[PDB]
């Protein structure tokens, strides 16, 4: 029954700037009789374990790098990044261990940068695939920001609707921007019943919209 | 030194049990208790519980009790998490974490899915017509999760690997893919290299204009 909760939810900072995390607990983990704070933070990046950051509130771990700090007391705690960098894109949490474990709900934290035209490419399906009868056809945005971006499909110039599935990568933790993927999947049938295969693209990075179209073969 | 290694992968049907492991190594296993911990697919951190890894005692937070043992093997450093009639919901990562400092498992993913193992089919999208994009489409796979490089992992600039999108047919799907100069095509070689390791399927294709 100690409740964790953080604020805000996520967060979009930008490069060299101060990030700040807020955690508040519903009772005290301030123990009276040592005085510690049994609190910790932790940084949590895709595929990997939480890793360590702070405990007993402020104790930075080993090796973590001086910009990170931890502050506050009794039900109230802020984790501190300076001066943000580009490899600090990751979830956080904060955790009480004076009496059983609870995690906070998180905290995504993005970075915020310039505008970024994304670069529109397509692709037609492979022969290989068409050979077992169906098609793929891949558009791709590389390297825009920010994540809003709009992908429409147009077959013959008539309007798609409810046979393309998008995905986005991660922020890049080397340049801060996303990608996205985005398939049209067709039997092989319809495929052949059309000739010029068209992805249209919507941004801020863009005065007007821009087209990549190729025809089937 | 301290090390909390786990048990692999494993895909299961609802009703079945399963039986995660963790082997500590590097310290004196019966002198800090061990916890569990559950993250499901793109959500939070929660805490499952905690073994005395002296007298063996297991304490259960509230929202896991009934289908879950945990357990341990002294002999080995080992703990181990006993779920019993999987349902798709405990479809998530299982961690393990070690009371005092910063010691945690890779963790376990443990799918729930009556669906079978299935390997991909890899198809380039080749480069045509500065900057040349190329990739690979990595199609009709399950379950999660697929791994992709670029030349035995020569070329890691400049990739950029997708999210699975899980397809209506209850088959997942995700493409990789990787900018170059377009002068490079003719001259230098490019090939994706993929690793689905539930169903073995391994596979360096190549893509050319």
């Given at each position: 029954?100690?409740?964790?909760?953080?604020?805000?939810?996520?967060?979009?900072?930008?490069?060299?700037?101060?990030?700040?995390?807020?955690?508040?607990?519903?009772?005290?983990?301030?123990?009276?009789?040592?005085?510690?704070?049994?609190?910790?933070?932790?940084?949590?990046?895709?595929?990997?374990?939480?890793?360590?950051?702070?405990?007993?509130?402020?104790?930075?771990?080993?090796?973590?790098?001086?910009?990170?700090?931890?502050?506050?007391?009794?039900?109230?705690?802020?984790?501190?990044?300076?001066?943000?960098?580009?490899?600090?894109?990751?979830?956080?949490?904060?955790?009480?261990?004076?009496?059983?474990?609870?995690?906070?709900?998180?905290?995504?934290?993005?970075?915020?940068?310039?505008?970024?035209?994304?670069?529109?490419?397509?692709?037609?399906?492979?022969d290989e695939q068409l050979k077992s009868g169906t098609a793929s056809v891949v558009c791709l945005l590389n390297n825009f920001y920010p994540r809003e971006a709009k992908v429409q499909w147009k077959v013959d110039n008539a309007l798609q609707s409810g046979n393309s599935q998008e995905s986005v990568t991660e922020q890049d933790s080397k340049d801060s921007t996303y990608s996205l993927s985005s398939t049209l999947t067709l039997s092989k049938a319809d495929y052949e019943k059309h000739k010029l295969y068209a992805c249209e693209v919507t941004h801020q990075g863009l005065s007007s919209p821009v087209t990549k179209s190729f025809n089937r073969g | 030194q301290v090390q909390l290694v786990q048990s692999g992968s494993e895909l299961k049907k609802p009703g079945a049990s399963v039986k995660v492991s963790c082997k500590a190594s590097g310290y004196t296993f019966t002198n800090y208790g061990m916890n569990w911990v559950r993250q499901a697919p793109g959500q939070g951190l929660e805490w499952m519980g905690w073994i005395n890894t002296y007298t063996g005692q297991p304490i259960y937070a509230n929202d896991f009790k009934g289908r879950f043992v945990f357990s341990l093997d002294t002999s080995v450093s080992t703990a181990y998490l006993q779920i019993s009639s999987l349902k798709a919901e405990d479809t998530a990562v299982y961690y393990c974490a070690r009371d005092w400092g910063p010691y945690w498992g890779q963790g376990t993913l443990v799918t729930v899915s009556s669906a079978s193992t299935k390997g991909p089919s890899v198809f380039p999208l080749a480069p045509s017509s500065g900057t040349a994009a190329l990739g690979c489409l990595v199609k009709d796979y399950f379950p999660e999760p697929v791994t992709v490089s670029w030349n035995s992992g020569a070329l890691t600039s400049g990739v950029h690997t997708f999210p699975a999108v899980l397809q209506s047919s209850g088959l997942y799907s995700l493409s990789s893919v990787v900018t170059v100069p377009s002068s490079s095509l003719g001259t230098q070689t490019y090939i994706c290299n993929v690793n689905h390791k539930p169903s073995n399927t391994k596979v360096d294709k190549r893509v050319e204009p």
């Open positions: 029954d100690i409740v964790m909760t953080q604020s805000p939810d996520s967060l979009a900072v930008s490069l060299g700037e101060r990030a700040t995390i807020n955690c508040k607990s519903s009772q005290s983990v301030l123990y009276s009789s040592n005085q510690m704070n049994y609190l910790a933070w932790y940084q949590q990046k895709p595929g990997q374990p939480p890793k360590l950051l702070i405990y007993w509130a402020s104790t930075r771990e080993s090796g973590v790098p001086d910009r990170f700090s931890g502050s506050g007391s009794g039900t109230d705690f802020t984790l501190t990044i300076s001066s943000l960098q580009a490899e600090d894109v990751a979830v956080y949490y904060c955790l009480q261990y004076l009496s059983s474990w609870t995690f906070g709900g998180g905290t995504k934290l993005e970075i915020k940068r310039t505008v970024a035209a994304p670069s529109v490419f397509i692709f037609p399906p492979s | -």
